[PDB]
Amino acid sequence: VNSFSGYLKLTDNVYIKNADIVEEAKKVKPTVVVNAANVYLKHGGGVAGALNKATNNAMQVESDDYIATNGPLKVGGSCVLSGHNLAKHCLHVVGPNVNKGEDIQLLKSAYENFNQHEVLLAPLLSAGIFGADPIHSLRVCVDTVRTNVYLAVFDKNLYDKLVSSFL
Ligand SMILES: O=C(O)C[C@@H](NC(=O)c1ncnc2[nH]ccc12)c1ccccc1F
C-alpha cells in the first residue's frame, strides 16, 4: 500500500492521473520521481523545466556536475541523481525527441530503465514537446514496465484522450 491517490488503474502495475508531477511529488515524496531528461541534462521545459524550477535550480546545478564528470547520457539511457525536495531520488530518463529527429524506436529502451525501481512517479515519456504519439508511448509503457508506475499527465485534454483510447 502507498499514498498515491486518485489514480485510475490501467493494468496490474500501471496507474494514471491528470496531475502536475511536481505537486504529486511534493505530496507523496516518492522514492523515485522520473524526469523526462535530455542527454545533456539541460532542464529547460516540459517536465524537466518544471521539476528543476521546483528545486530552485538545485537539480540543474547537480546535473551540470554530473555531465562535467561523466559526459552526456545516451538516448534511451538514464542516471540516478538526487530528488532534492521532491523525492528521495530522481531517475533522469532520456526518451527520443521526435522534434530532434530521434528514433521513436528507442522509447522501449527508455522505459526499460523504470524496471530497476520497484515504484516510480513518472511522466509519459516522449509526449508533449518531445513530439511522439502519446497513445503509442502509453502502450509502450504498459508493455515494457513491470514495476509499479504512477503516471502523472499534465494536459487535461490529453489525459482524457489517453484514458478513452486505452486498450
Ligand atoms: O501533458 C503531458 O503530460 C505531457 C508532458 N508533460 C509535462 O510537461 C508534465 N507532466 C506532468 N507534470 C508536469 N508538471 C509540469 C509539466 C508537466 C511531457 C511529457 C514528457 C516530455 C515533455 C512533456 F512536455
From Swiss-Prot:
Positions of the Macro domain: 1-167
Cellular compartment(s): Host endoplasmic reticulum membrane
Reaction equations catalysed: Thiol-dependent hydrolysis of ester, thioester, amide, peptide and isopeptide bonds formed by the C-terminal Gly of ubiquitin (a 76-residue protein attached to proteins as an intracellular targeting signal)
Summary of activators and inhibitors of this protein: Inhibited in vitro by GRL-0617.
Organism superkingdom: Viruses
Effect listed in the UniProt record for changing S164L: In strain: Gamma/P.1
Membrane topology reported for the UniProt record: Multi-pass membrane protein
Role played: Responsible for the cleavages located at the N-terminus of the replicase polyprotein. Participates together with nsp4 in the assembly of virally-induced cytoplasmic double-membrane vesicles necessary for viral replication. Antagonizes innate immune induction of type I interferon by blocking the phosphorylation, dimerization and subsequent nuclear translocation of host IRF3. Also prevents host NF-kappa-B signaling. In addition, PL-PRO possesses a deubiquitinating/deISGylating activity and processes both 'Lys-48'- and 'Lys-63'-linked polyubiquitin chains from cellular substrates.
Subunit and interaction comment: May form homohexamers. Interacts with N protein.
Protein name: Papain-like protease nsp3
Source organism (scientific name): Severe acute respiratory syndrome coronavirus 2 (2019-nCoV)
Shown stretch of the complete protein: 1025 to 1191 of 7096
